[PDB]
Amino acid sequence: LVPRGSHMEEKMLFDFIEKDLSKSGYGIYTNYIDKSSEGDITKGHSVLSESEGLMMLYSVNANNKELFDEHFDIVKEMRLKNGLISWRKEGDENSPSSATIDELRIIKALLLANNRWNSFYYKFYAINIANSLLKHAEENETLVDYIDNYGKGNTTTLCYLDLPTMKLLSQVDKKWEGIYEKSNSIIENGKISEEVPLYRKVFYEETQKYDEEENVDFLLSTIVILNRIEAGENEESSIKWIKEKFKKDGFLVATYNGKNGDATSQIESPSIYSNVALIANYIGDKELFNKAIDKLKYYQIKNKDSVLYGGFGDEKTNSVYSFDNLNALLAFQKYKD
Template structure:
């Protein structure tokens, strides 16, 4: 071997060693979060809504109609009424979240009268100064002047999909135009989705709530308003990077764009936050096999609990949630995973009140109370009940 050839060989070996050693250390510019091995569906085979609707679905809808709905058509946050108003919604407040979920149920079940009534309510009661308020008290003073982007995106996406089925009424058309105008200018900050925004001063959120990132809706908005195109890639990467670990294949709650880091609240992982992230991904045909396997195992064994330790993966309580099972059923439907949907619905129906003498019959209640979120997410899951 010639001298030049030996030197070249030595140089190649040294470079290989340097690369190997460098790769063993975390770099300041890298996010050290474990990235999941995601898969993409060739097409997202959304499971069809079962028709006619099952008795459990109709019973849940009747409970919501009779026990959680105001005379004017708003969905109460709680079954129990209270005059107390605080930072968190209580009593008979009305949320844009609830009305958006009901609007989605009407679209899925092709109930155009309910869809139109819900749109009329949103336009009449929730939109003030071109802002879709996230919480109100009917016939009372305003308790907020801000809009929640998670609810706006859901309603916007639902209206977009409904337009493919029937002409939108005047209220739905106005809501659609309001959201398509407001979201690009107020709903994002440097491409990052903000949590809330108002008609006045610009929002300066320091963190992004990962569960708020309705990627399907952001994609739809970007197709109509090109100025939001960069937000698609930015927020998709936040979603993909929020995977915690193989030990607990769930998702972080929030992301700090300035630090490039993720965090949970109170040192624990709330299952609803993680399920909403999984749903955001599933609705655009993305999923982590690790997360799905973990979710199926917990549901089949009846051990899907509310909070988990992000370090050990251990459950921190034994509390179950009808909303969690409802969302899990929807994730299965979005991915065409009938096994996941069926097992989630089996667990969900165990919590449905079957006592025909109870005011909670057909619904999902706890400790003499019932909550709109639990019942509406359960209702959206039950539409796939065979």
């Protein structure tokens, strides 16, 4: 009953990300190794604003203003002439393109930071980004995924529709209510089936229709589900489906058949388990939460002699993805034992 080694997993994982996947003043690397042997992967030590946005969310949750500011300073330098944050940098070069989901994740961290630390600067900077999203990515109240200096795409991935950020934005300015309402309508009209109450992957603004994939991308649906509930919307049937599936298979994998709900992949991911844990945390489901956390504990590299100690990835090849590690850090942050 006296806690022993509380927050150990979080510490180990933060230590790995800070010492082994980061460079001071530069940011969080996308992969542990910049170039794989044989050259298949080549930009491992680029920095994604995805990674930075995740670390900012973690910092505000951790009430760590110093760490928050250190990653926000890197993001400010990734800002492009259109007001959006670049998707990626390599050394000193920013990519001229942006993804809506990264912009919205950063706006969310900034608005949370303003609420937490009473610092208007974060809020004003978030507004600049948000106004640029409206100017550059919006079409009939729908935000499209992709934006560069020449124009924008015409597809909307449902996991990009960050309802919680749009809700926060609506509290600052009413123009965001229409965006929230359209986004939520896209989500609500995109259920896969009654048997498998997960979500479509993409919405096509031109036809107002969804993809027709037979398989559900599970990670993406967990993102949509987490977004829905944090914004106060209803996900009772989807969460039941996840809880039943996790209970019956004993694991969750990358894809399921949209008709009958059978696993169609053998691949597990720390990002899937992270999201399931964040969902369970949010709704107060302790059993689901522990089940998801147990998977993350199991896959975390526990070997003190591995350079990957504390992290997630393949010990044999030193293959590591920042995205899985950062999502795991967010889940372990909720784990109090």
